Amino acid sequence: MSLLLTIAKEYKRLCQDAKAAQMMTVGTVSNYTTFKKWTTSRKEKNPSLRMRWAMSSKFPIIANKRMLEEAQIPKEHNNVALWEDTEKRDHVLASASCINYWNFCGPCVNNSEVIKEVYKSRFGRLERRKEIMWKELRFTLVDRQRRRVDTQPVEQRLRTGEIKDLQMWTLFEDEAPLASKFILDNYGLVKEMRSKFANKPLNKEVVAHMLEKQFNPESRFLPVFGAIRPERMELIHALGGETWIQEANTAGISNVDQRKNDIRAVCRKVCLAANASIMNAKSKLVEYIKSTSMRIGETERKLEELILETDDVSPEVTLCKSALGGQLGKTLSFGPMLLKKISGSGVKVKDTVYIQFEYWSEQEEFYGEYKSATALFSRKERSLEWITIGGGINEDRKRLLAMCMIFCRDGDYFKDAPATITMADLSTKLGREIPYQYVMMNWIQKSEDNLEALLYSRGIVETNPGKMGSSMGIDGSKRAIKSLRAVTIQSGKIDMPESKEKIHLELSDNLEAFDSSGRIVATILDLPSDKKVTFQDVSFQHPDLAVLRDEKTAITKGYEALIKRLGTGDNDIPSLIAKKDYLSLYNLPEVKLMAPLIRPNRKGVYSRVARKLVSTQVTTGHYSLHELIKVLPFTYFARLFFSNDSFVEPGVNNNVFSWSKADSSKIYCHGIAIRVPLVVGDEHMDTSLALLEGFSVCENDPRAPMVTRQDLIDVGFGQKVRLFVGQGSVRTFKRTASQRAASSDVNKNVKKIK
């Protein structure tokens, strides 16, 4: 009680000091960030020495008085002094040993469960080590010197600006800005985190700092030995280095590593959807992106915020990103191959040669990344000048060689003409002529002798002495009896370059991205995988994949009408629940849309028990807000509710209706929908403050009472109210219809203007 007084009295004392008063008044609050920075704690000249000097004295350490006064005796067991009344700060000085005593004999119970899930980051990184096997040997290992690979991977990894929002929300409500983008979309993780942390007020500053690290993969530039899974990264040191090796590792990994790959396969299909119709590629893929909803192991998350903010850049993922405003440069994709550009420059030039063609005339040096095989190439004037291969497996080296020769594009490119004109020439996609590099590429991907053909197209020579280890056989061996020209293997791997860069530009109408004013990064279609397997994945809106039955679309859309259209204002569910009037709710016109799909036999018999439950829940503190939606539609007329021969029981989550626990979301077969502001469900206690918001900012004119956030629930609809926001600024809102058309509003006008 005085805790809040003494602070005010302190404020009084401080604003009386005119010097402090002015600096407190002038300028923004941001100034704090500066004012803190005008304090270094102490001199940092001799670190170890200073500490050895520090601990040498018996009573130097600063400590907390009040708590030790409250809980335990300040005096000692062996008659060596521990405590005094001597002092500038409120913290009184004490000996080092005391700390060890309270650890021993202090009275405390039941903290064990509270700890671990605070540092699930660290504790998990422990847990993972338990589950592995071991083996030991030696070798002159050739490690892969530079990979910018995620280390310390955790599920639901995200960017630094957004995680800060989470940090803010989960820390404390009182001083938090109403940040929409992250909260609306990624709510659910919000619930979980906020729930486990907000209830027990402990270590407020610390927890926040450790959560920042909890979702940050430390993507450092490190030397790896072929085990490229982000789990093995954490503990590479024990696993190896240049002369060490360990075994039985791949097994115990977190659920993330595969879940990324899944998203690649999602993006694959989402790109095929836009491939299917070449009326437009720009306006349609974006729809498939923003519509699609992902389900992570423990959270529902949008596809957009995964794609935009994923770490790993695959050929697909590049294309997925290109639709959105997501800058992820330094990546070059070509078919299955990955490339990086290190040297030189030159212009795109047109050259017709007998089998139009785009050729580059740069003295350019680039790095080749293929499965189990790395290499270094340099092209000059449309032909490979210098080449070296640092691969593992013989095949994959050959694949490298070929793939890079394609991109290289010699005169022998044209000479090989088995078929092509019959099939590979014209792609069967609304009569579209597919680009030429990719044509020969696909011609080589076709069969086994097609690889042999161009492999033989290069100059072949019996290599010299001084090139036996270096020479490359046609079959991929190091024998050097016969070998390819302008090429040498290296006994060991090749290092990968890295650049801290961001580049982004719009995409062309055929899934091409002329980023950095050219460069052909997009590769159109990497892999023609004609497959449709999914697990726990959501899709929506004329998706061109038939998962929607007539009877199920009727039910689902019938529900969606009700769920979605409600809560904006008066004569919608929220006001009706707030009034305690449940008749208007029965007579709702969106229920009349749902009426004719119920089984006629028991229509009244259902409506009976439906009208019962809804009425019994009218009393506050007992109603389940999810159930009401499930139960409502049958109430219109005068356990198993057959809606066109399919049942919907109260509770008992099923195919038609999934009542999810502890988070606002609900599944209808292979589909998901939810509403955010109209929530006061008894299970949503922790985020009753967060969830209730479908408000928006108007004007500051009225004399609206300064209500606390918890008081915001009571003020009804059309009510202009005043509130403290974030770290300072105070604004005014009302109960308003949900923010709408963030992207489209612009996009359509932008389309109209041309």
Binding site: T28, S30, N46, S48, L49, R52, W53, S56, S57, W134, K135, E136, L137, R138, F139, T140, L141, G161, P177, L178, A179, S180, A238, E242, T243, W244, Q246, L324, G325, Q327, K502, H504, E506, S696, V697, C698, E699, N700, D701, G726, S729, R731, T732, K734, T736, A737, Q739, R740, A741, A742, S743, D745, V746, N747, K748, N749, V750, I753
Partner: protein, 693 residues
């Protein structure tokens, strides 16, 4: 990266219009974000709403090209016949049938509204929004929803602009977009207008020559002329292969720079009690009850510089020890520190004593006298190499729990290496260094500006593997001598060392030391008492030196890496556990005897490296630092010649001059030089790309 910023908070496609507009409409890279707001602000205001008819309620004009927007504003002159609004508005309503233009300002609304209102009057529906929620408008407001939605966007945008702290840049034309120039102070402009290098004096002309620069290939000729004038040395290694061997200074033999004596130093054994020894300061107090109290030197010393002072002090120490280990002196301290102060004179009054030159006024600074190569050092190394009877000195912690795969290897290697190196005399000296310098390091905090008696001790446990059940391996601490603290000058402490010894002193190396004849001490063995000498000296200890000499353990590690790496590099070739084999079988060249090159196994030639690293810790002078950091170049050139790489060095005389230059009075530094000579020699004998005199 403005795009980066804009596209992060704004809508992806909305930025493109800004980016495009900025190329033609204006020419300022930052402003994309300013207009980026304005544009988006409009679109939301005019799209969702449609008129009662099939046509839309509003039509957008701003985002279109400025040139197109003109001709689109000229339509209104055809449609409604109102005066050519010389100013191009943003939007046209069809339900309200009027001109609409939107403004967005940071400050209190009036400030900006009055401007735009001044521009067009009541002619258009002018709506001016503030990010904070402040509102200003013409007569009527937009519809209740779009207000709500626009302000919500603006408010959130604002917070994003405050998080990145972009504020005074964002203001609107009449206010601050005009004043974007860098402030031009006449002082600065002058300073600049005479800071230029060229014959050109004004900046503008230098600017012009810079901006309009196109450099032709005359730099070839400039570079050849530069080359002729250069006469740059195109050097070869076969020609200068001699390197004139290595130059070495001539004069008096270098002295014992180390703060403590090693080889000759003498021990006094004491079986330690955990509760008596814990103090470490009381160690001596419990020693004195033994024989120590008996020893007293004569007034007449061998090879002494200041006998009577040290002799007195000894008695003051001994006298102190009985009562309490602190010297009760106010005046003797000040002398003993001095053995001095220099009284100061103000410049102001000195002017008269320059005019009248008295006290003989002058200015001089002094240099250190060069010394010659030491002989003893070899013997010191040879003694520091061999195993002492006492087992282990440096307190090493326990070993951790281990997994079979790596921990076994590490734990094993460590246990063996420690096991070898703990027995050595080298380790002894490390131990005493650590324990004593540690003891002083405490005393500096405990009693500053005070005179304290600190012992020179080391802790060791004797190990007995006679295969019998003995009482125990003997647990103890032994003493080397007594030390005296004197706090002076923060800065460097002055220290006074008194060590016991059983060996006859040598004037050539102990020149700094002052020796006494102390008495006689008993030494014995069975399968005789020798005279005792007391060595005394004074030295300077920097806090830094205290710190780095107290952590002497480090030397182990630098050895370890170096040792281990060899075994791994070896074993890794054969893909087998060759650590244990390599350690015992791999032969390292250690020394020379009877003119023949000798080598030992890596487990015993380890000791060498450890000694070397310990000496590197002890004998570290700025001389040595330079010595090594120019020495590397010799080694690289050497290994160049080894693997027949046909090296070269541009000014070897100049290198050897820098090597010579850093060789002053540092026993180690010199030793290493003289050894590098013999290296160069024996190397030249193996493979000839060097000289022998």
């Amino acid at each position: 990266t403005f795009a980066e910023i804009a596209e992060a908070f704004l809508e992806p496609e909305a930025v493109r219009i800004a980016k495009e507009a900025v190329e033609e409409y204006g020419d300022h890279e930052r402003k994309i974000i300013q207009i980026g707001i304005h544009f988006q602000v409009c679109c939301m205001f005019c799209d969702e709403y449609l008129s009662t008819n099939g046509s839309d309620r509003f039509v957008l004009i701003e985002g279109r090209k400025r040139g197109t927007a003109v001709s689109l504003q000229n339509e209104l002159c055809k449609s409604y016949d109102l005066e050519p609004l010389p100013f191009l508005c943003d939007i046209f309503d069809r339900e309200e049938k009027q001109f609409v233009e939107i403004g967005i300002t940071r400050k209190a609304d009036d400030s900006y509204f009055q401007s735009k209102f001044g521009k067009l009057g009541n002619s258009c529906k002018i709506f001016v929004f503030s990010y904070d929620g402040r509102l200003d408008k013409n007569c009527e407001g937009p519809m209740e929803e779009q207000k709500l939605r626009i302000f919500s966007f603006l408010a959130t945008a604002a917070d994003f602009l405050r998080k990145e702290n972009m504020f005074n840049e964002i203001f609107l034309p009449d206010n601050e977009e005009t004043i974007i120039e860098m402030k031009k102070g006449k002082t600065f402009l002058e300073l600049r207008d005479e800071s230029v290098p060229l014959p050109f004096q004004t900046y503008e002309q230098m600017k012009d020559y810079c901006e309009k620069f196109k450099g032709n290939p005359r730099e070839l000729a400039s570079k050849v002329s530069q080359m002729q004038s250069n006469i740059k040395l195109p050097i070869k290694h076969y020609e200068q292969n001699k390197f004139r061997q290595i130059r070495l200074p001539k004069g008096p033999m270098a002295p014992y720079t180390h703060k403590f004596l090693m080889e000759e130093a003498w021990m006094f054994t004491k079986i330690s009690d955990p509760e008596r020894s814990r103090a470490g300061e009381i160690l001596i107090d419990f020693f004195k009850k033994g024989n120590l109290s008996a020893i007293r030197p004569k007034d007449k010393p061998l090879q002494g510089k200041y006998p009577i002072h040290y002799k007195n002090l000894w008695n003051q120490i001994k006298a102190a020890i009985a009562d309490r280990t602190m010297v009760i002196n106010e005046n003797d301290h000040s002398e003993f520190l001095g053995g001095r102060a220099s009284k100061k004179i103000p410049e102001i009054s000195l002017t008269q004593d320059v005019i009248t030159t008295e006290g003989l006024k002058q200015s001089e600074n002094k240099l250190p006298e060069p010394r010659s190569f030491p002989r003893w050092f070899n013997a010191e190394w040879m003694w520091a190499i061999k195993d002492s009877d006492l087992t282990g000195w440096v307190p090493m912690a326990e070993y951790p729990p281990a997994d079979n795969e790596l921990e076994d290897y590490a734990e094993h290697l460590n246990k063996t290496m420690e096991g070898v190196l703990q027995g050595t005399n080298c380790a002894r000296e490390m131990g005493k260094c650590i324990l004593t310098v540690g003891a002083l390091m405490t005393e500096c905090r405990l009693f500053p500006g005070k005179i304290k008696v600190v012992p020179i001790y080391a802790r060791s446990k004797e190990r007995k593997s006679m295969q019998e059940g003995l009482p125990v391996p003997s647990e103890m601490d032994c003493l080397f001598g007594i030390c005296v603290k004197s706090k002076s000058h923060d800065g460097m402490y002055t220290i006074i060392t008194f060590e016991f010894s059983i060996r006859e002193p040598n004037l050539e190396k102990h020149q700094k030391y002052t020796v006494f004849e102390a008495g006689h001490t008993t030494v014995r063995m069975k399968k005789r008492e020798v005279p005792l000498y007391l060595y005394c000296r004074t030295t300077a200890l920097s806090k830094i030196k205290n710190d780095w000499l107290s952590k002497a353990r480090r030397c182990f590690i630098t050895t370890m890496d170096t040792v281990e790496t060899i075994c791994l590099r070896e074993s890794a070739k054969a893909e087998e556990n060759l650590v244990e084999k390599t350690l015992n079988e791999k032969q390292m060249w250690i020394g020379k005897k009877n003119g023949e090159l000798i080598a030992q196994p890596l487990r015993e030639a380890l000791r060498v490296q450890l000694v070397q690293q310990f000496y590197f810790c002890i004998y570290n002078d700025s001389q040595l630092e330079g010595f090594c950091n120019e020495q590397k170049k010799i080694l690289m050139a050497l290994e160049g010649d080894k693997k027949n790489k046909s090296s070269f060095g541009f000014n070897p005389e100049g290198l050897l001059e820098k090597i010579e230059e850093c060789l002053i009075n540092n026993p180690m530094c010199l030793f290493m030089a003289q050894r590098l000579n013999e290296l160069v020699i024996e190397a030249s004998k193996r493979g000839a790309k060097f000289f022998k005199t």
